[model samples]
Target chain A: EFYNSTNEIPEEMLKGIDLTYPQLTYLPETGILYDNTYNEKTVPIISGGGSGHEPAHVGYVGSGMLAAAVTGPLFIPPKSKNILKAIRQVNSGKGVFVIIKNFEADLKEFNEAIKEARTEGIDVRYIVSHDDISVNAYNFHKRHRGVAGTILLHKILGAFAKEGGSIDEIEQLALSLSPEIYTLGVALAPVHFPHQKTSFVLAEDEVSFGIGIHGEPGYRVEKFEGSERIAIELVNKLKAEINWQKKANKNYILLVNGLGSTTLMELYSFQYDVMRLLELEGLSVKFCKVGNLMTSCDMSGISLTLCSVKDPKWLDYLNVPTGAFAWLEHH
Target chain B: NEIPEEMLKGIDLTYPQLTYLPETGILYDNTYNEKTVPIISGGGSGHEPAHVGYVGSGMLAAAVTGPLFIPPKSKNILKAIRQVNSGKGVFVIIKNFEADLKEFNEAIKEARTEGIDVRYIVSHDDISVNAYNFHKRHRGVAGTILLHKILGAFAKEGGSIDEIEQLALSLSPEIYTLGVALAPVHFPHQKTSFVLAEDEVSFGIGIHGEPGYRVEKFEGSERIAIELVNKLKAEINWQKKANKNYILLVNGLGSTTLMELYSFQYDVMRLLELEGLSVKFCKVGNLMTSCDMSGISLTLCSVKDPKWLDYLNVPTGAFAWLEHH
Candidate 1:
């Protein structure tokens, strides 16, 4: 019934994607979901990676988010030309701002794509998101994979781009904001695609902390006690890095993103744990998002993000309304 | 540290849960005032966003969430009514469960006797799940959310208690839901809970691992939609009505992906078009889930009134239906 990992993404999946989102046209040739509605938009925002992460770059394609998302095959990087075509499709005189996750192939191919876009004089600028604090927490900086916090990055930066900020202004904001955003994930099981077995092995009662979105092994694997223990551990690791001295209630937004398979039940309960943990640290949570914003191809895990508000404007940008279908109603 | 207990506390903040009384497990709409008539709904809390996710100014005014699969007591449902009722009246939306219906009826009786105006609507939208015997009644599914949206919007727009009640009664017959359980989810079943027959999809299912109404072997989304839509159209006798407007709700039974749901929407909508019915509105996503099963429920509400459609489409700020635009 389902294809194996070696199988190419069926063209029907791409067309099925277009049917639900008629506003988005899936170009099978380029594998880019170009927004037919994005005309004379502020700055054309674009982001994407692999396809197995359903609703990632594609799901975020609308106003108030990325205007174009270059889709790759499942868990694979896209070609440079398709990436360039997506940039060209959304470039309506306003520059293109690409959001590339931090992975070796993604970086290499996206870098080449941007080089081509510049040659075409499309006024494109981009910011690499290393919001996955796990890599930094363990000094695995060799390749810090971008994860769920990238969605928030897309939200804020997309809003800024939509608001007609200059390319420098957008880049400055992205630079100021990306490092401040921190994300750490925990997985109960390994990643799986279709009929494939999990990419990694784990004990039934074990949990891996500091995991990436691609089923990449985590920094440590511990006994699966319950939500509370995991929440406390992930929060402590984040706090150790941020070390925001408690002043007046700290302004922070939280996103408890699921790795595909975790339900809103576990996510909501875990969101509570994260909120309680943050409140215990003299923080007042102003905004929160909990869902499968990012995924490891149906892996069972939850990734918690705490992006401390460095400026008041970022919060306003986050709250700005968009045509995005995937970004949930903000709290 | 206690998962469920601590969950309720932090839940109110993160998910925008309304005024919650942890003791009684009631979540109240904080935005309700004396001028607007109140609306409430509740059930077991395990079904995330079904009862509580629908709680807001434009949906459920207040709802009682029982622990896990348990039903809230009548005393507590009354507690919720008392809290939500101002000088204006309150309308309670309930699903069809013997214990659940019993508790709400007892609460309604107690509350009405005390000089309060209370009317309740039992959402029996689900089709028969068994051999017209044990679980034969129309079990309520995610279509209850639509009922909440319509009635809450009516109350918000200054409809009187009688007006809201009449509309609810009128709308009840128009709504129908059928849940298919495709995959089983893992749970720490104390006494017991349901699991999935992964290779097959069961029809007429209950939320808490209850026996399904029927079982259909696994097939593509198109075939499943055909079976469900055929049964749905037969129940409504759409051929008798011929080309009426409707609202479609595709709810995920827990872990069904949006990709899958959207594809189902595509197929189901195409099939409905072939039958010559127009979809006035369509809501797709995990608005309701049977706690992470790999299945979905299709809900259709035959809309006759423009006002009902207006109410259904009214902007709501609830966490679940929070729209971007």
Candidate 2:
């Protein structure tokens, strides 16, 4: 099967091979994996996850976005050893910073890796991403699960990273930008494990609202309804939370993510409604991406991520390319 | 025993029995029987169009479904094949169910004895169990759709039965399939089937009534997928060395939305690359289904054989046929 087996690497493909860390399973040992191979001197950014999200870590491993990525086994964070290995391999004289999604495993492992790099006399920093609004409904103090908003972090941070911003600059930017982002998800149907062959069943006309990206229990389940109503409900909830005044000159980034089983046409239709609602709210969409950026096996659902942009510079960074897979110019 | 009003509103059901060979238990009408390879697929009623709805000009010559997927009686199997034989040697596509295999095999033997030159293609694409361990009892799942598409295309392209059979056989090693369901499918005339909680999803589900691997609480879509794709990669050792390119299919069992399929595809593609593999052709939509179970299945066809790509692109009127760009 194509999904299995290690074929011989093409001879021409090894032009810029770097240090190979054979001990690293998900994160590549080769520092030169996708570094400036296409667009050198661009801001080199890196992101990754437990080896389950396919294009998240690696698909974005090209030029104009992420310089390199380190991944762990499915849903598991890369071991500290693998994280350090990936950092060292990809660290150019220009230095490197990390983008860590705010999951406990990911945070612990990445922080430990940073400490290890520090001990080795290599300077490194990281930005923790926690933009999942659905999971943090009870005020802002709860342990929030990172949802699809990590993609937005990648875009904004990758922009600055590509522009050759120093570690402090990128970290400060992420710190200020993370709080302004929020995402909510809903599952029309349950997802299943490939080997399990069964799913969490809902009634014929029910849906799980505020569901997590990994199929976590949602805030509540409600009767099935049309996409337009769903869009209205989501917009209303977000607007209430942010208190949209209509007079503010704020730009917003919108991401409509599929939860695995949904189709493109259906998502596009839903996005159309969302766009109209945004227009009604007088929120100018500076950036928009409609596709599956994250998933839960084959669960039938979609998530909306909104990053309120107050500064034009942030939008500029959001539009910059950082060589990550799935990152597009804000067209 | 009675169709639900909701189901009727969303679908158009037609039930017509085979007349050429009453002994065969196949039943279907010729809504589409034009200049193309007639696709004839059937199983229990639970698998939906596994043996029925997919029938069309370039897809199936005719579909022969058994009673609720218990496998048709021998006579019914023969009758269904004969009804659509077209005097050009019928091709029988069967899953690995015991009764289905036995009845279809018997029909083929009888047809050969009668100088019918009939051929049969058995689908065994599930990799969850070892072939040796399961011996002759292994079941088939969504990968059967790929077989129908590939073989159906060859037949429509005027390939001989031998050519079609050979092409189907060559595709076996290149394709691997795994599926998970959110809920169990309900039998026709039965009010309910299985129960699941709000934060639970079953992993590694079989097409039939077999139990799945685990029933874990929901986390996030990315996490659930990590469990499935990671296990699949480990079982297959997908990233031992250089990354290989693959064709990905994120299929909806039934009643799953396109949004869910797309998100799943995105995660699947990312996971594949994390494991050091590349995705070439990615298709996320409803291909095959198990009635109205809200679930999704993943099929990975390693494209070592480039010709498989060509075969996949062949056009067909079969409902499950994928149009390649």
Candidate 3:
């Protein structure tokens, strides 16, 4: 309702962001927002997708986070040409790095842009985020779409690049870091887009599991249970997939990300339950964040991201201050 | 619009030390020391994270909630006063609404009769004008969050109940807020409270989806910024209080995005600069909100003491209170 016409939203949104945040500059021709204060001596990082995820690529663009972010339409990834413009704008002599979410469209677009950039003699490398482990209910086929864990990737890789890590060094850190991040989401209610049916259907007393950020249905739907029960299901699913026993480090960073319209009261309480369950499993909770970092359009749900901190310096990376407004500073 | 029971359970779970009394819809921090005066506040529920989010660490000792847009019952507020009360007396921050005053005053009066010393401050910071007569009307709005932070910090810094009362009185008058809506708010299973044309915007809307003072064409962000800044400037009497430093809050009313908020904030910054006002601090986000209203608010509190800045800077465990970096 805030917008007059659907077609004007992407540009109007970028216009709003361009005027407000001091560190970032939005180039209208390509729909790219990049940090103007990025260090040329180090490699630059870029990530972006559709417009509805408010803080997502844009909010993470600052000194200690993303170097540039290119946007597309609602729930759509930017085209290769626009992404190429972003690479040209942010890349300095040190080269450029890109973080791509595991969505099919995003992978296609980002990979093509990376290829073009490389062809043009700009050193570029990337890591595809496949942090989500939600499976299809019928065949149990895992949909490894990247969700909230990509934000954590931005922080970790952003800090590495900030610390003067070479392009190869940042790529190594990202490769080691990507698999450790696992996320699962649930929707108490479905998203409502004008003149369209909801992304999925749910009864009043029902909840759906494994929901995607674009209002895609989850793997399971069951009676409306309490937050504690939801926490148990998400934690157990993540635990089985993580298989911490197979790994050396047992610590993890917890992110209780609110899918738009869920309140803080709901998030923290859900975190309370997750913490209790993790404590029962002897999983050392290294760092925890609860907020609406990444959101679907007015979808009522939450996504829990467990990033197993394999390196102590990753914690330091998360701790580094940034001018990005959406990144929560405190625990 | 929330299932009150689940919302309460969620809040209590987030901060393990906070205890919830489901019978009265009260949530209180049990970790407050008895030596300092305990502070508490409560209001309707639709404004997510208002009173509830202010409870913990450097802010409130307890907060109570009623159903959407309904103030907590007097008995429940009294129960909270008794639960958080120690020999050192208690202080309550009340939003300036008729229903809220009735409940809060009833509770405070009974607490006094029960010999638990208590005092209260009414936040009446809103400066929206009346649509009928174009005269000013004041109600507690987003600026109340600032009241919570300042008083909570003062209490933690060892202010007596009487001292906190003085500070709240002095500070409440200095804070002013004006809200605008890009679209009407829609309650679950119900239609929107008001109507706005596709090209219209409402000025001076209330948090409970109250209709605003004026309805007009939907102008650009800078135009709305100009209207609000000038209105606030006149309300604060900037010419009279010339050269005073002030704190700014560009708050989103619920469904408004951060992109809009920060963009509006940029307009606000330039407007304030043109007016020759010095902004010592600024917060741009959804500090207080209506249920998914597509709009934002601007709050300007003229700085009176240097300590107020430090109070704003104090870190809090409350999740909604984003720390200024």
Candidate 4:
């Protein structure tokens, strides 16, 4: 059943294909292709980055979520040409919105794509997802590269577009929502690729806190605690950035996502703790989600995303449908 | 002959009848007539505190078994179910495997001939296989734990066999799973079942000998994760329903510790947010397992019913019950 690798694209299959990038491996380029099918009436939302994070870019392409997703090879940025292709393909009469993470390579390549799209008379607006708090302030030059929090931008803006909102309005909404969100991760160990069998070793009982999605070394490595302690610590750290005690109207969205190898029991335990902490602080959790939406291969960890709901409309926008990979509604 | 101190301590053997096996690893134990639905589940032996440990109050009435790493015999299975015949009915939770199906199906027929109300629910949460085409060979992994929990809770609440079946079947389509192995498991007496260098993991590996999809050098947790999540997202066509909610499970095979499990949970949640999928409930722990294998499985089950969470939280004395009620 397993055939050896071979270069075999049937001639019949190639019939009538005007353009085809044989080895394109990013979502933005795929987005460009999807743009042509929509007759340019829909606003194109482009998102992409490293190749391994699936469904993030490509899986979320459809009528509501995103028009295009551009991705690079695993953990690498997509080429400038692919980004340009994605922009051009998604450029209908309506302008395109590119949701770029706060990575240097991503910014450099996507900016080049935006510059090219403008040259061709396509109106392009760019929004950077900088919700990850683990990115040190000293690294401001590099910026807080987008993490899983970018998915929120996709849902909010995708909904606005579907509701017939203009590109300018959607752009303004995305910018407004981006600042109110924050995420931090903690890992007990690292996730390795299938071929790469071993991960960076930590002491048996240690955990890496404030880690990035790429298994970037965490800000602190400390003795492991039970789920409750972890929740308390994470909630406390996130709370420091926002006022939770004095607010009369407490509303926020909480996400408890898993790293690769964590289990369901632990997620629940962690959620229980998160809920307990939020309730103790007298903060009302308007919306909450806990699960494995994104992952490191097999690294064992969890991340928390806290989005203060400044506008009641933001909650409605979050619930709107989209084609992007992780768009969802509460059951 | 000197007896080992560990052996002298006497194994807790929570459910002794589950230890014996027939010609095939299948064992029959008809020892209860409980008021609730009789629950039965079988798989390769070694993942303790599963199938058997869960046979307690408000959970399974009795559990049958197969040999070490093999399916049960037809007669043993039939005999096992007949022994546990409660006046109400029996709900069998069978994992995805050919021999398991053949034996369980035969037992179902035998039970029916005797006027026994016997029905079985098949679990196909493993997304590693193309379910439509390879329906017969798909491996049932951790998600079986959830099936057991949900079905057990319903039965405990006096739901009829038909109602339980409907609920189980409804969930079948929405639940999807994929697993990766950090290391292969060895039998009690064997030294090694697989050989690996210091830096490699296997993807799409089954609990038994099913070939994995790929193997690669270790990478960061986030990068390695995208493959499994992507496969599930594509298989379920998740992109089309961008504004839907889902239940996420990060299950550890027996040997993977709880601390490691939590870390993985953190990364996956972040990744899900990036995809625009809202996660309603995240469960991370060792529910289903493969002997002492160092591996984990990721399961994404779309919550079609709001009450499903309530059902999951209904209390029972199952092995790893997670009840909030």
lDDT top scorer: 3
The candidate that wins on DockQ is 1
Better candidate number, 1 or 4, judged by TM-score: 1
Can you write out model 1's per-residue Cα lDDT over B30-60, one digit (the tens) per residue? 7666678888888876677778778776778
lDDT computed for candidate 1:
0.77
| Candidate 4 whole-model C-alpha lDDT, 0 to 1 | 0.64
Q: What does the TM-score come to for chain B in model 3? A: 0.95
Q: Per-residue lDDT for A195 in model 4?
A: 47
Per-residue CA lDDT of candidate 3, range A1-331, in tens?
3321234337656755665555668887576988877767678898988777777878888877888888887788888899998898887757799998888899999999999999989999999998877873223766588898889999989888888899999999999999888888999888766554587888977899987787788888978767778888888788788887678787888898988777665576677678778888888877877778888877789999998888888889987766566763533
User: What are the lDDT scores of the predictions, listed in order?
Assistant: 0.77, 0.62, 0.80, 0.64
- Give the Cα error of residue B270 in candidate 1, in Å: 2.7
TM-score of each: 0.92, 0.51, 0.77, 0.56
Q: Distance (Å) between predicted and true CA of B91, model 2?
A: 37
For A1-331, candidate 4 gives per-residue lDDT tens digits of 0110122211111110111111122232232324233446667687777644433554455567776666565456677787888777677758888898887878898899889889889889989988777645212334465777777787778777877877888889888988887887788777554344445667766787777666566777779776668777788777776666666668887777776556433454466567667888877666665545556545678888888888998778776644332443321
| lDDT comparison, 1 vs 4, better candidate | 1
Chain A TM-score for candidate 2 is: 0.83
Error of 3 at A9 (Å): 9.6
* Tens digits of per-residue lDDT for model 4, B106-197: 88899899999998889878877662234345677777777877777788788888888888898876778888777776443445557655
Ranking by TM-score: 1, 3, 4, 2
Model 3 DockQ reads 0.27
DockQ of 1: 0.38
**Which stretches in model 1 have alpha-carbon errors above 4 Å?**
A1-41, A139-141, A192-196, A245-249, A328-331, B1-3, B15-17, B130-135, B189-192, B195-197
Q: What is the DockQ of candidate 2?
A: 0.03
